[PDB]
Design a protein around this ligand. Structure first.
Ligand SMILES: CCCCCCCCCCCCCCCCCC(=O)OC[C@H](COP(=O)([O-])OCC(O)COP(=O)([O-])OC[C@@H](COC(=O)CCCCCCCCCCCCCCCCC)OC(=O)CCCCCCCCCCCCCCCCC)OC(=O)CCCCCCCCCCCCCCCCC
Ligand SMILES: CCCCCCCCCCCCCCCCCC(=O)OC[C@H](COP(=O)([O-])OCC(O)COP(=O)([O-])OC[C@@H](COC(=O)CCCCCCCCCCCCCCCCC)OC(=O)CCCCCCCCCCCCCCCCC)OC(=O)CCCCCCCCCCCCCCCCC
Ligand SMILES: CCCCCCCCCCCCCCCCCC(=O)OC[C@H](COP(=O)([O-])OCC[N+](C)(C)C)OC(=O)CCCCCCCCCCCCCCCCC
Ligand SMILES: CCCCCCCCCCCCCCCCCC(=O)OC[C@H](COP(=O)(O)OCCN)OC(=O)CCCCCCCCCCCCCCCCC
Ligand SMILES: CCCCCCCCCCCCCCCCCC(=O)OC[C@H](COP(=O)(O)OCCN)OC(=O)CCCCCCCCCCCCCCCCC
Ligand SMILES: CCCCCCCCCCCCO[C@@H]1O[C@H](CO)[C@@H](O[C@H]2O[C@H](CO)[C@@H](O)[C@H](O)[C@H]2O)[C@H](O)[C@H]1O
Ligand SMILES: CCCCCCCCCCCCO[C@@H]1O[C@H](CO)[C@@H](O[C@H]2O[C@H](CO)[C@@H](O)[C@H](O)[C@H]2O)[C@H](O)[C@H]1O
Ligand SMILES: CCCCCCCCCCCCO[C@@H]1O[C@H](CO)[C@@H](O[C@H]2O[C@H](CO)[C@@H](O)[C@H](O)[C@H]2O)[C@H](O)[C@H]1O
Ligand SMILES: CCCCCCCCCCCCO[C@@H]1O[C@H](CO)[C@@H](O[C@H]2O[C@H](CO)[C@@H](O)[C@H](O)[C@H]2O)[C@H](O)[C@H]1O
Ligand SMILES: CCCCCCCCCCCCO[C@@H]1O[C@H](CO)[C@@H](O[C@H]2O[C@H](CO)[C@@H](O)[C@H](O)[C@H]2O)[C@H](O)[C@H]1O
Lengths: 62, 84, 242, 459, 171, 170, 97, 108, 51, 63
């Protein structure tokens, strides 16, 4: 699913869920364990914002 | 410093303090389901005691596969880099 | 190096030399909090300390700019001699810088996060180096603050909310290092309260006395953690008295 | 200045007449000797500038920029010789010739008394710089980077030429020593508003001013290492040096004409610092970092205070070494993994422990840790702009926080964390690379002991 | 992706761990753990699978309300205090290739044994690639499972980075 | 080593020891140790060095600048006269900066020297500092980075015109 | 078209484990390290830092201090103001009007 | 009390109503996703485990990301212009009147 | 020496540059010992105050 | 890394030690100049307005 067709400049780059990398399964054998990414999978447009050192979107107990 | 025999001794020691297991029937190769008559709820509690015995977590995807004491000894030995 | 930068800070006679020590302890705390640099949470905590302390540094440079513009000096001797009466702006800057350095409410979360560092780091960070620097800066400037009731009211309420809020956080924490860290934040708030009641020398005495037993508490927690193979949750301790 | 012009020119026959395998040894060795003699320019007086002849002079503004220029040539030679190792011999010698010809134009540019002479030399630097980028860049869009760089410059520089020729007709001279005594005030009129803009916009593009800056990241991403080094360290400062000189004849009109550029600079420094937090190309991040730092220099020059001019001089020198060192650090990773993507090769402190230290020191100077001359320059500007208006401390302080955030973010992302598993060609740091890093940082830190030689004429 | 049986068993373990965080004391935990087990044993034989899914969904709603906001985490588990603590000391084995000959000379026995492993790796690789070609359907792998070696002298395909990975406590 | 009139200090008043205890003073014994172990060897090295210095006595001088006509006496655009006047004004500007620095050093030394009594006892220094800063401000403040004797004169004449007007309205 | 394949990257350390990274030829590589280290560190940095440390009163700030001391001494000994507001003598100024 | 998801705090998977109703269509889609993942995993692994490979395994997903990413404009300038202009007009007015204190201000 | 003769080029360029800088001062001697600031009487063995 | 730091240390000290020793001997055995009033009728050389022997050597030789 692409980003909405505006002048924003996303082209056909996929719009992926707005979730932190912290939400990915820490036990799965990621090709990049520190980022929890597999080689070849499409990267979120804002991946650099969602690395584990930055913005977390994980469910909260409250 | 853990050893293969040391790990095995403690895995069986924990199982021999579990009332649902008869310590006479228990061996390293006893299947928790087929030989000891336990259920999968029981298996989850066995894995939890192992995690408590050695102080580290066994993720659910790996834990569900450990159906006898030897498979637990192998799993613990592999994660702790025990070769002897 | 962490000790050296602190002694630069404490013996500094002009604001530029003091700024050298101020920023030095900040970066040494970044290097020691992020000691285990393969751990993302350690790197995150180390950068968080830099973030909050650089927000407080805005206050430090504001005071530096006001003192140069209005008094033509960065030397403590000339500032106290000229004794400005419209000191609201320079002191508000110092209070902001102290708030970051001493983890007062608003710029406070980084101090408990600093528990990422090895235990000796926490013992030295919380006792004789970084965190008391914010309090020390305000004690250095008591000749100005003792004539400013408005500044006293601000530091009083800031310390009061700090000492109560962080002590309240400590009531439920299960990590032994965080309980002690929140104890330091609460003790820092009390020191800020002492500054707010115009008792700088009492605030200074608490820095000295606090150093002894706060560093001891961390070393005792480190003794426990080491004997329990890096366990830090108090729910897994118990029965250690004998 | 002939004692520097002639030996620099002689570097050309040295390079072309050297044995094939000695071109880097000979050019590097002798360019370092020229750099050593450049320290004779430190004979500065309290009142008068050092006026050699009818063509060239050297005051405390030009001298530190001259020393930086001649220091940078051997560093660029050291930095270039590896990725040019497969080049054929004639094209290597042509590459070294461009660098030498760039030094020749630069040292003449910084020492010219007459402003048209400064203009011609200021323009001449474009040719070797453009040729270095388009001929020896790696990627397809180096051709576009050249055109953007070329035509941004000429869009501003041609109005400057017209203004300069107009000023000589009215005043009778463009000798900078004469202008100091015959300068007359600039009264309000639309004609003087365009004279002001024509006198300034060319230097604004070079700095670059925020809003005229997009050529810079494009240029850096395409340039070879030596191109980035000279561009970041010296070529940007041509605009800073030009503004510091030409503002002499723009008073009092600068009072109100500076506002829109100060607003662009003050806000632009926050915008570009924030942009650095989200850059994915390491070279592009360093390029945006330069824009943010040079925004401070523009503010310092425009508010025209003794403290701001001293800070501007120190910032220009300090940034030149720091930014050049960062491109060299970024390039050392690139020569292993052949990518500028910042997230590609992580955890490099585990694999390259000493290069991690250089990264640490470069980052610490980039965020202006006291008492580095980076902080001295920044602090002086912050001091002076507070007097200009107290509210500026808010934007200055916020920029300090963001700069620390992206500087350390660079360090944490590339050097810390876990190493990338599949990257198995991270060979140990070479002696050449370690020497290159240390030849930036050591003189930069030694300047802390004697900052006065980089504070400029207002000292 | 998870079966119903897997979801119930995951919930039981997760619920028990949070209950322990609440109870703290072992005798108190034992008591309430058995009560919790009896709640699962009550509906163990529910054969109506629509009813069973309702039981699990309410159970997970109950868990979310009653979870500990600061549960106990094993120190080296994700989110624990020692998680990734030793990553900085893990150095990949290819780094030894770049050691200077004088450094390698300090460990003559170790580096001779390393050469045998590198030879074992080189001579095995083609058979590993061939085994994977023969056993992979036309569309490519449908799962990530890798096979064992099938003959004598063969090694299980793609073994090097498992077998020679850094020790958990490498220094 | 320096002019006591430029950098004055009041006469020093040190009370005599007056022990009211039988316990020995540790500072007195450390002082004697410091004299024997630190000062004397230090003094011996220095006296050897000064003996070498006395064998080679040579001098340097403080440069004297003749006075030249001010910018007020320079014809417009006459750069030869303007140049000398401008250079002289620049030398004077640096000198006035150091005059202020001397007075600030006096003030700061008094503040430290007088301790908790500085506010009263440093009044004379405070007054002298106040006056020199006012004179310095009048001469040189607000000229800008491109300052000159011309701009300095323009400011003085603006100040003189404001003073002439105010006196007239009185 | 007909075109060469991309060359494989070369590791200087494989042929020369002692490489300084300057040249594939070991003799040239060692010479190039020596000029950089000698002319860079031994000469420019060490001697250049020494040269800067001993510059003769850079920009007269020491002379200015001595001169200021001479004027402060003279003016206070003669009951004169340390500094006057006026930079130039009013007698030499003819105001407008 | 039901969970309210927010942009910065997602709905937990155990509370997501679509996690318990998994049909044949959903299972088929998950298998297609696992197949794509496995195919990429194998392609990566045959290079990562190749004993003769020295270098970087170029990732087209990473390249596409950097390429896509490398591919409120007067309002704040006007806002800041009026803030500083208003402040400096006020300040200049007071200095001309003598009502601004600059007693010890000789650095600028 | 055909091996190392090229190493005198930059050093000779510096000497020639130094010499030409000095010759240029010889063309700018119109105010030598004539500025109001520095003008004086020549010393007995002095031909010129500076060169 | 260790080789580079040894080379860096050696080449800094190669001239650093001789310069450090040279400064000490100059300070000890030549010493600094002494301030004097300009004798009446005496015109000092431009390098006689500086105190340290290295500074007045720099002024004499180069400036
Ligand atoms: C005249 C010409 C003289 C030329 C200059 C001579 C100086 C260079 C001498 C180097 C000689 C070669 C050598 O043997 O050094 C070995 C030395 C130690 O040997 P090593 O353990 O093998 O180091 C390898 C690791 O990278 C070591 O890793 P590391 O992290 O342990 O050490 C690097 C260390 C860098 O260490 C330092 O810079 C010392 C800091 C003390 C100041 O990094 C830091 O710690 C950064 C802390 C910065 C914050 C300090 C707080 C601010 C205080 C400001 C005080 C200002 C004064 C008032 O190597 C290095 O430190 C490399 C960096 C050299 C740069 C020197 C810059 C100094 C400033
Ligand atoms: C790296 C920068 C490299 C740039 C080039 C260096 C240029 C240079 O040499 O200038 C340096 C300067 C040379 O100055 P100069 O203009 O040649 O001296 C002219 C005097 O009239 C000449 O003085 P003098 O005639 O009295 O010299 C005689 C002296 C020999 O004096 C020397 O010539 C030694 C010079 C050091 C070697 C060069 C390094 O012989 C002695 O008696 C040694 C004293 C101990 C006897 C027992 O000497 C030094 O600075 C030596 C180091 C500083 C002395 C130790 C101070 C202790 C630290 C106190 C402050 C820190 C407080 C604690 C806080 C710690 C931080 C947190
Ligand atoms: C804990 C503290 C840790 C801090 C580090 C140690 C501190 C050591 C300080 C004491 C050492 C003694 C000392 O300071 O030396 C005396 C001096 C400083 O003290 P000084 O100014 O009083 O000089 C002493 C000599 N007398 C007394 C005569 C004045 O050192 C220097 O001045 C060194 C200046 C070096 C700057 C020039 C660098 C050369 C760069 C060459 C150009 C190539 C790069 C291009 C540059 C860019 C263009 C400009
Ligand atoms: C005034 C000028 C203000 C300037 C503010 C600059 C804003 C910068 C915000 C960060 C920019 C992104 C950089 C990367 C930082 C980041 O994203 O890391 C997130 C980090 C998470 O840390 P943590 O909660 O411990 O969780 C880690 C375990 N996963 O958490 C962090 O480290 C970032 C947290 C800091 C967020 C800023 C909040 C500052 C406090 C503002 C309110 C206080 C009011 C001012 C003080 C009042 C004084 C009385
Ligand atoms: C086309 C735009 C030209 C603007 C008009 C400038 C002009 O023609 O003014 C005329 C004036 C000369 O008139 P003169 O008789 O000599 O003096 C009395 C003043 N009326 O000229 C002057 O007094 C000043 C002339 C200065 C030269 C101006 C150079 C061109 C100005 C337009 C460009 C400025 C903006 C730069 C944009 C760069 C883009 C990157
Ligand atoms: C009469 C007016 C004209 C005046 C001309 C004055 C200069 C005359 C120079 C004549 C000699 C030229 O020398 C001839 O060219 C070059 C450099 O010299 C030499 O060959 C060169 O090859 C390579 C460079 O490519 C290097 O190793 C080195 O520069 C040199 O050996 C030839 O072996 C020599 O035969
Ligand atoms: C990024 C670019 C930033 C651009 C900033 C633009 C600043 C604009 C400045 C506007 C002021 C221009 O200069 C202004 O020109 C007019 C010329 O008619 C002068 O005024 C002159 O013409 C008008 C006619 O309307 C007469 O009323 C007036 O008597 C006469 O002196 C003003 O004295 C001068 O103030
Ligand atoms: C005024 C300052 C000038 C400073 C210039 C500094 C330049 C330093 C460059 C040094 C490089 C020397 O590099 C190399 O060393 C030796 C020198 O005998 C020679 O190498 C070899 O040459 C021939 C044999 O082939 C022999 O005479 C020599 O003994 C042998 O070592 C090379 O001909 C020279 O190129
Ligand atoms: C650390 C190495 C630094 C290398 C660079 C410096 C090299 C030269 C340094 C010292 C040179 C000798 O220093 C020089 O000695 C004599 C003092 O004897 C001084 O000369 C002065 O006194 C001597 C008598 O003593 C007489 O010649 C005369 O009265 C006067 O010229 C010089 O003004 C001084 O500069
Ligand atoms: C950072 C250091 C860089 C070093 C670079 C090295 C370049 C080499 C420069 C050598 C220059 C020597 O140049 C020569 O020195 C002697 C010193 O006795 C000077 O000698 C003269 O100096 C002054 C000039 O008024 C007088 O004392 C007198 O006329 C005479 O002694 C000459 O004026 C100069 O022609």
């Amino acid at each position: 699913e692409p980003y909405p067709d505006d002048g924003t400049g996303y082209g056909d780059y996929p719009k992926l869920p707005d979730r932190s990398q912290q939400e990915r399964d820490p036990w799965y054998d990621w090709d990049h364990p520190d980022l929890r990414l597999n080689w070849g999978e499409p990267m979120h447009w804002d991946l650099d914002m969602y690395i584990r050192n930055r913005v977390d979107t994980s469910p909260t107990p409250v | 410093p853990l050893t293969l025999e040391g790990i095995k001794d403690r895995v069986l020691y924990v199982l021999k303090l579990y009332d649902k297991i008869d310590p006479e029937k228990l061996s390293v190769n006893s299947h928790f389901m087929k030989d000891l008559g336990l259920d999968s709820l029981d298996q989850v509690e066995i894995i939890m005691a192992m995690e408590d015995e050695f102080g580290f977590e066994i993720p659910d995807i790996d834990a569900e596969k450990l159906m006898c004491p030897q498979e637990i000894v192998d799993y613990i030995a592999d994660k702790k880099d025990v070769y002897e | 190096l962490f000790l050296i930068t602190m002694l630069i800070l404490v013996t500094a006679n002009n604001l530029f030399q003091l700024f050298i020590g101020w920023e030095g302890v900040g970066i040494m705390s970044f290097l020691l909090i992020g000691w285990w640099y393969g751990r993302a949470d350690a790197n995150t905590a180390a950068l968080q300390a830099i973030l909050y302390n650089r927000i407080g540094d805005i206050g430090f440079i504001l005071a530096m700019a006001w003192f140069l513009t209005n008094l033509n000096t960065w030397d403590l001797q000339q500032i106290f001699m000229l004794n400005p009466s419209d000191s609201n702006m320079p002191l508000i800057g110092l209070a902001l810088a102290a708030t970051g350095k001493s983890a007062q409410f608003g710029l406070h979360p980084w101090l408990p996060s600093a528990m990422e560092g090895p235990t000796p780091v926490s013992a030295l960070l919380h006792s004789s180096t970084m965190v008391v620097a914010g309090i020390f800066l305000l004690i250095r400037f008591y000749p100005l603050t003792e004539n400013n009731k408005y500044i006293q009211s601000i530091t009083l309420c800031l310390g009061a909310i700090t000492t109560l809020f962080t002590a309240m956080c400590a009531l439920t924490q299960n990590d032994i290092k965080k309980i002690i860290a929140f104890s330091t934040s609460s003790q820092l708030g009390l020191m800020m309260v002492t500054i707010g009641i115009n008792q700088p020398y009492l605030a200074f005495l608490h820095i000295c006395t606090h150093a002894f037993f706060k560093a001891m508490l961390f070393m005792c927690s480190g003794s426990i953690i080491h004997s329990l193979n890096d366990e830090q949750d108090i729910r897994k301790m118990g029965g250690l008295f004998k | 200045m002939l004692k520097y012009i002639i030996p620099t020119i002689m570097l050309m026959p040295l390079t072309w007449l050297s044995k094939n395998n000695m071109i880097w040894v000979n050019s590097t060795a002798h360019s370092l000797l020229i750099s050593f003699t450049s320290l004779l320019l430190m004979n500065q007086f309290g009142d008068n500038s050092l006026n050699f002849s009818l063509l060239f002079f050297s005051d405390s503004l030009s001298t530190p920029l001259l020393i930086l220029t001649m220091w940078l040539l051997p560093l660029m030679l050291m930095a270039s010789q590896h990725h040019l190792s497969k080049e054929n011999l004639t094209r290597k010698k042509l590459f070294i010739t461009m660098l030498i010809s760039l030094q020749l134009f630069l040292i003449m540019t910084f020492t010219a008394m007459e402003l048209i002479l400064f203009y011609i030399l200021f323009e001449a630097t474009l040719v070797p710089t453009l040729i270095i980028i388009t001929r020896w860049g790696n990627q397809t869009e180096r051709l576009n980077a050249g055109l953007y760089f070329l035509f941004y410059t000429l869009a501003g520089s041609l109005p400057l030429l017209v203004a300069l020729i107009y000023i000589q007709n009215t005043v009778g001279s463009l000798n900078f020593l004469m202008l100091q005594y015959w300068v007359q005030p600039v009264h309000n009129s639309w004609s003087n508003v365009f004279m002001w803009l024509a006198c300034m916009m060319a230097f604004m593009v070079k700095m670059p001013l925020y809003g005229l800056h997009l050529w810079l990241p494009k240029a850096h991403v395409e340039a070879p290492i030596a191109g980035s080094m000279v561009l970041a360290a010296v070529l940007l400062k041509l605009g800073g040096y030009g503004m510091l000189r030409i503002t002499l004849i723009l008073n009092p009109m600068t009072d109100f004409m500076a506002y829109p550029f100060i607003m662009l600079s003050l806000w632009g420094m926050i915008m570009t610092s924030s942009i650095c937090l989200r850059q994915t190309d390491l070279k592009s991040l360093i390029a945006y970092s330069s824009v943010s730092h040079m925004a401070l220099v523009i503010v310092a020059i425009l508010i025209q205070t003794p403290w701001s001019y001293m800070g501007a001089t120190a910032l220009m020198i300090a940034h030149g070494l720091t930014s050049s060192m960062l491109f060299c650090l970024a390039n050392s990773n690139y020569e292993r993994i052949h990518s500028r993507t910042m997230i590609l090769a992580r955890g490099l402190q585990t694999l390259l422990p000493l290069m991690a230290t250089w990264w640490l020191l470069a980052s610490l100077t980039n965020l202006a840790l006291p008492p580095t001359i980076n902080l001295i320059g920044e602090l002086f500007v912050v001091m002076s702009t507070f007097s200009w208006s107290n509210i500026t401390i808010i934007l200055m302080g916020v920029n300090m926080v963001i700069t620390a955030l992206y500087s350390l973010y660079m360090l944490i992302m590339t050097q810390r964390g876990k190493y990338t598993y599949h990257i198995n060609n991270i060979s140990p740091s070479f002696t050449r690379e370690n020497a290159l890093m240390s030849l930036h940082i050591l003189p930069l830190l030694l300047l802390t002991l004697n900052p006065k030689i980089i504070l400029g004429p207002l000292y | 992706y998870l079966t119903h049986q897997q979801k119930v068993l995951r919930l039981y373990k997760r619920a028990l761990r949070h209950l322990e965080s609440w109870c703290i004391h072992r005798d108190k935990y034992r008591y309430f753990a058995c009560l919790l087990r009896a709640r699962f044993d009550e509906h163990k034989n529910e054969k109506d699978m629509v009813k069973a899914t309702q039981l699990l969904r309410e159970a997970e709603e109950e868990f979310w309300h009653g979870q500990h906001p600061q549960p106990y985490i094993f120190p080296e588990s994700p989110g624990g205090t020692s998680y990734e603590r030793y990553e900085c000391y893990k150095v990949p084995e290819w780094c030894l290739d770049d050691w200077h000959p004088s450094e390698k000379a300090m460990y003559p026995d170790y580096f001779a044994k390393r050469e045998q492993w590198k030879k074992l790796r080189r001579e095995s690789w083609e058979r590993e690639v061939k085994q994977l070609q023969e056993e992979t359907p036309v569309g490519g792998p449908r799962t990530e499972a890798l096979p064992p070696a099938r003959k004598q002298g063969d090694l299980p395909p793609l073994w090097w980075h498992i077998v020679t990975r850094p020790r958990e406590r490498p220094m | 080593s320096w002019d006591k009139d430029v950098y004055p200090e009041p006469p020093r008043r040190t009370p005599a020891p007056s022990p009211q205890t039988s316990l020995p003073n540790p500072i007195t014994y450390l002082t004697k140790a410091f004299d024997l172990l630190v000062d004397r060897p230090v003094t011996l090295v220095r006296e050897f060095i000064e003996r070498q210095h006395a064998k080679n006595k040579y001098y340097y001088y403080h440069r004297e600048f003749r006075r030249v006509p001010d910018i007020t006496e320079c014809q417009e655009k006459d750069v030869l006269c303007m140049f000398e006047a401008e250079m002289q004004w620049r030398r004077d500007y640096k000198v006035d900066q150091e005059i202020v620095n001397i007075i600030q050093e006096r003030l700061k030394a008094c503040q430290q020297r007088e301790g908790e009594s500085h506010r009263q006892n440093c009044a004379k220094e405070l007054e002298q500092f106040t006056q020199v800063v006012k004179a310095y401000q009048d001469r040189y403040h607000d000229l800008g980075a491109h300052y000159s004797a011309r701009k300095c004169l323009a400011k003085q004449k603006q100040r003189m015109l404001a003073e002439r007007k105010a006196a007239k309205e009185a | 078209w007909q075109e060469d394949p991309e060359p494989e990257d070369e590791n200087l350390y494989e042929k020369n484990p002692d490489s300084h990274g300057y040249d594939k030829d070991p003799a040239v590589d060692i010479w190039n390290m020596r000029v950089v280290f000698f002319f860079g560190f031994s000469i420019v940095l060490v001697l250049g830092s020494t040269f800067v440390a001993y510059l003769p009163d850079y920009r007269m700030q020491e002379w200015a201090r001595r001169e200021a001391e001479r004027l402060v001494k003279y003016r206070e000994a003669h009951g004169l103001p340390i500094m006057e507001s006026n930079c130039f003598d009013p007698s030499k100024i003819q105001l407008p009007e | 009390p039901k969970y309210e998801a927010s942009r910065l705090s997602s709905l937990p998977t155990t509370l997501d109503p679509a996690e318990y109703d998994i049909s044949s269509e959903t299972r088929k889609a998950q298998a297609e996703r696992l197949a794509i993942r496995s195919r990429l995993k194998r392609e990566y692994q045959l290079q990562y485990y190749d004993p003769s490979r020295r270098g970087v395994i170029e990732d087209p997903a990473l390249v596409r990301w950097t390429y896509a990413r490398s591919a409120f404009g007067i309002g704040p300038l006007v806002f800041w212009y009026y803030v500083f202009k208003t402040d400096r007009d006020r300040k200049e007015k007071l200095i001309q009147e003598g009502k601004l204190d600059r007693t010890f201000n000789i650095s600028y | 020496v055909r091996d190392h003769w090229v190493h005198v080029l930059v050093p000779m360029g510096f000497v020639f540059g130094y010499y030409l800088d000095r010759k240029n001062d010889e063309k700018l001697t119109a105010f030598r010992n004539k500025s109001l600031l520095y003008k004086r009487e020549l010393k007995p063995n002095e031909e010129v105050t500076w060169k | 890394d260790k080789r580079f730091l040894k080379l860096l240390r050696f080449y800094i000290l190669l001239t650093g030690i001789p310069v450090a020793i040279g400064i000490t001997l100059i300070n000890v055995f030549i010493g600094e100049a002494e301030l004097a009033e300009i004798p009446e009728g005496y015109v000092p050389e431009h390098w006689e307005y500086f105190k340290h022997p290295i500074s007045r050597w720099i002024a004499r030789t180069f400036f």
